[PDB]
Design a protein around this ligand. Structure first.
Ligand SMILES: Nc1ncnc2c1ncn2[C@@H]1O[C@H](COP(=O)(O)OP(=O)(O)OP(=O)(O)O)[C@@H](O)[C@H]1O
Ligand SMILES: [Mg+2]
Ligand SMILES: [Mg+2]
Length: 356
């Protein structure tokens, strides 16, 4: 309520007298408010400390990345300090932060067309490019092992072994798909480990609703939602974007005849992404762009299936078989990626040469 909210806002060095504070946006993790003043506007968020208990480390990650982008004249989340100079405030139990409102933007939920998907690729390619000289090792793992696929596979096997709901009996083909792909899961972790794949900043929630684009030009403006900034390989981010974004269907589509991996959307994202990162991407990274799609789609699928086997404790579900329906789309997508490897390899090689 306003009196509590107005009081909360008083903790921050706003550059305008507060005039209103109301719920804003469609975020589901933090609690987001729009602060209107006699002047500029702000985003005020109560941070979800159940999901992110370590506020100091999370905000440290956000400060490091945003400071680097700001230092280079790049638009990003701009933290407004507390009146005491901190990046966030402890208030009667809660953890609160303020960002300058990024004005004159729009954003998308579902991918509307290849052109917008290309611009999403451009947004994250630009993000990667301007962080190419940032020492990613300074960042902490806010969610440990987040895209450590071998670790996720161990978790999957534990859920399978426990079979607490006796659900394994009903999904043998899905289980065997993940078991049979076992020797593929370590490709990127091994690469990061031996230095053949660069350690880079990773965003880890590359969904389009985190890419603000200009309200008039439609061009990428800024990457937001920096809660999950961590070290990793950019292949984790690229692969996941391909996972959700190059599908012709929703993640929980029941009719598998409608679920396809679209090479047109793959080409669109890759054009935008590589177009901005051509001077930094390594040969090994380029080599793995198509496979990163397989990897992150398999990782996501195995997590859905593990959750199904464990009684749906991690992902929200709407009906008993929701996670099983989800895992099946991810399986369909990977098999198509496997079968179109010739095409995607050729697509990447062509885009690499064109970007020059
Ligand atoms: N600096 C900003 N300027 C303008 N709009 C913003 C800013 N930060 C967030 N938003 C908007 O606020 C809402 C919440 O965004 P954010 O991605 O930070 O939410 P979240 O709490 O991480 O939840 P989720 O992970 O579900 O998105 C979105 O509608 C987003 O468009
Ligand atoms: Mg978001
Ligand atoms: Mg978020």
């Amino acid at each position: 309520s306003n009196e509590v909210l107005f009081g909360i806002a008083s903790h921050f060095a706003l550059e305008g007298a507060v005039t209103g504070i109301e719920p804003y946006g469609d975020g589901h993790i933090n609690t987001t408010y729009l602060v209107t003043t006699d002047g500029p506007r702000y985003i005020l968020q109560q941070m979800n400390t159940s999901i992110f208990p370590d506020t100091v480390n999370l905000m440290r990650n956000v400060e490091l990345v945003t400071s680097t982008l700001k230092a280079q004249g790049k638009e990003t989340l701009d933290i407004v300090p507390t009146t005491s100079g901190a990046t966030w405030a402890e208030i009667d139990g809660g953890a609160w932060r303020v960002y300058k409102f990024i004005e004159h933007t729009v954003s998308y939920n579902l991918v509307p067309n290849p052109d917008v998907f290309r611009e999403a690729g451009s947004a994250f390619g630009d993000f990667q490019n301007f962080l190419s000289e940032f020492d990613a090792s300074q960042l902490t793992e806010t969610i440990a092992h987040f895209h450590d696929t071998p670790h996720r596979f161990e978790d999957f096997k534990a859920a399978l072994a426990a079979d607490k709901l006796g659900r394994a009996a009903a999904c043998q083909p899905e289980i065997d798909f993940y078991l049979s792909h076992a020797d593929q899961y370590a490709v990127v972790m091994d690469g990061l480990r031996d230095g053949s794949i660069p350690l880079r900043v990773t965003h880890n929630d590359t969904k389009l609703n985190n890419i603000l684009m200009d309200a008039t030009t439609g061009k990428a403006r800024a990457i937001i939602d920096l809660d999950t900034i961590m070290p990793g390989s950019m292949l984790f981010d690229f692969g996941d974007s391909i996972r959700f974004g190059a599908s012709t269907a929703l993640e929980d589509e029941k009719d598998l005849s409608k679920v396809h991996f679209s090479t047109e959307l793959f080409r669109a994202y890759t054009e935008g992404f590589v177009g901005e990162l051509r001077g930094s991407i390594t040969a090994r990274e380029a080599e793995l762009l198509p496979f990163s799609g397989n990897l992150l789609t398999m990782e996501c699928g195995m997590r859905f299936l593990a959750d199904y086997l464990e009684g749906d404790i991690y992902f929200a579900t709407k009906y008993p078989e929701h996670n099983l329906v989800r895992t099946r789309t991810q399986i369909k997508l990977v098999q198509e990626m496997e079968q179109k490897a010739s095409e995607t390899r050729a697509i990447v090689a062509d885009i690499m040469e064109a970007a020059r």
